[PDB]
Design a protein around this ligand. Structure first.
Ligand SMILES: [Cl-]
Lengths: 83, 80
């Protein structure tokens, strides 16, 4: 039915998010390797705040800005862990 | 530099993730309106575990399965 169809759309979106998160992970891994060789820090709160700023500014909804901020902070946290 | 270039790619991916998260939000809202009309529950922990299950199985890395599960649990909780 309609709920069944919507669930399939959610599966598609979930898989796309997994792919994008993984792509982001590989990018940050690359950045981390460069920072290590250049003797630079991995944690950059200025950069994190800048990303949170444009993401909240561009938030199209329905999630509240605070939720978008929360989710991306978690994504950024997972990245440092990986680096 | 090289890091600056990679950060631009990260920006692009961040924005794609924002779009997909928002799309997921709209879908969940639509499902909810139908569930309400039909007298069905919205909160479905089993369905959430089902989604975590294939995402865990399909995880291509580099994030560990535990991290993928934690991130999606946050996405699901934010959708409640
Ligand atoms: Cl669903």
């Amino acid at each position: 039915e309609r709920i069944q169809a919507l669930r399939k759309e959610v599966d598609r979106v979930n898989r796309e998010i997994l792919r994008l998160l993984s792509e982001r992970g590989r990018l940050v891994q690359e950045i981390g390797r460069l920072q290590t060789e250049l003797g630079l820090p991995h944690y950059d709160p200025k950069r994190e705040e800048e990303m949170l700023a444009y993401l909240t500014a561009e938030n199209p909804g329905p999630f509240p800005d605070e939720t978008i901020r929360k989710l991306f902070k978690e994504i950024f946290k997972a990245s440092l862990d990986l680096e």
